[PDB]
Amino acid sequence: PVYMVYVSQDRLTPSAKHAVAKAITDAHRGLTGTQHFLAQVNFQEQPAGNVFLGGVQQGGDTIFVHGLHREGRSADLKGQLAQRIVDDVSVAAEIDRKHIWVYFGEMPAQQMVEYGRFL
Amino acid sequence: PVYMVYVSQDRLTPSAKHAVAKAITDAHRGLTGTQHFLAQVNFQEQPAGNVFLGGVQQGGDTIFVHGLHREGRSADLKGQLAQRIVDDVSVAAEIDRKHIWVYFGEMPAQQMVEYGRFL
Amino acid sequence: PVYMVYVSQDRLTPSAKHAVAKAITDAHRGLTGTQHFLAQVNFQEQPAGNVFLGGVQQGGDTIFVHGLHREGRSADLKGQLAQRIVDDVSVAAEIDRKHIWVYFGEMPAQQMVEYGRFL
């Protein structure tokens, strides 16, 4: 999987980025069985003031986690993996759950390349 | 919904970002019935010269709006919501429709978390 | 199509960005038949140290290519287009295949707007 993680600049020190990528990655391997090195976490920073909720401009505390997964996971599984990302990122970032969004997009495995190799 | 809005740095003042998030958000609630606060608009700026159309490098006037929606919307509806985003962003940004791209990705609601809560 | 190409800041000079957008674009038109000007390549740069593989922090050499396509392409086709992007970007960027990830997301054409016009 590839987890696109959208945060504001300077809300996560370099040591907290690592804790959030670690939390996300572990949650994914512990609940799905996909090996460690197959989970990419790509942080996308933006300046404070680039997030809007109901047309209202936010500060720096929002995190949107967008996971791009292979298809074929029960709804039960994907829900557990979402809740666990919310909780684990919440601690690993020192941020309340309310500031944490999690979306999953699914793809056929045969159009999914990691390390230059197909799944 | 979450609308990832991809623009070049310094093409939208802070007051125009707000107008575009407002336009997008209103279009979504007026056509779908999802409440205001449930629509995130996340602007993603990049330097001028990071967009290519047919391998040809562009300036700062392109906007790509990528909406991430819950599944289960008629094709008629999604088309109206796309046209309305094109038109409303065009005015709210002072930019011609030709410079505006709009893509929607759909997801099951049960893998969709906002404010730390499932849909 | 729209190809979101995620790289680290200052790993691609401006002249290499153009070669990668050219490689991607040509691969897409040669294998699908979609005309040139319909392929957007949007580079998304981030600072070195924003990519994590298995919770381990990377330098600047990773490239994630995320294509957003219209639905309805055989699996055979999408695989050829993925391999060809891997190989062609590898040369056009001077980067080993191992550092290159490629994911495709598919959408209904009727929710897909380019140049302010529906597909």
Q: What does this 3D model show about the protein?
A:
3 copies of one chain form a homotrimer. With 119 residues, chain A is of the alpha/beta class. Helix content of chain A is 32%, strand content 34%. Chain A contains 2 helices and 8 strands; from the N terminus they run βαββββαβββ. Chain A has helices at 14-32, 75-93; strands spanning 2-8, 40-46, 51-53, 56-57, 63-70, 100-107, 112-114, 117-118. The first copy, chain A, has a 4-stranded mixed β-sheet, covered by helices on one side. A two-stranded antiparallel sheet of chain A has the order 3-4. In chain A, strands 7-8 form a two-stranded antiparallel sheet. In chain A, β3 (51-53) and β4 (56-57) form a beta hairpin. Chain A starts with a strand and ends with a strand. Chains in contact: A-B, A-C, B-C. The interface between A and B is medium-sized, with 34 and 32 residues. β3 (51-53) of chain A pairs antiparallel with β2 (40-46) of chain B. It is classed as hydrolase. The entry lists the keywords Tautomerase, cis-CaaD, hydrolase.
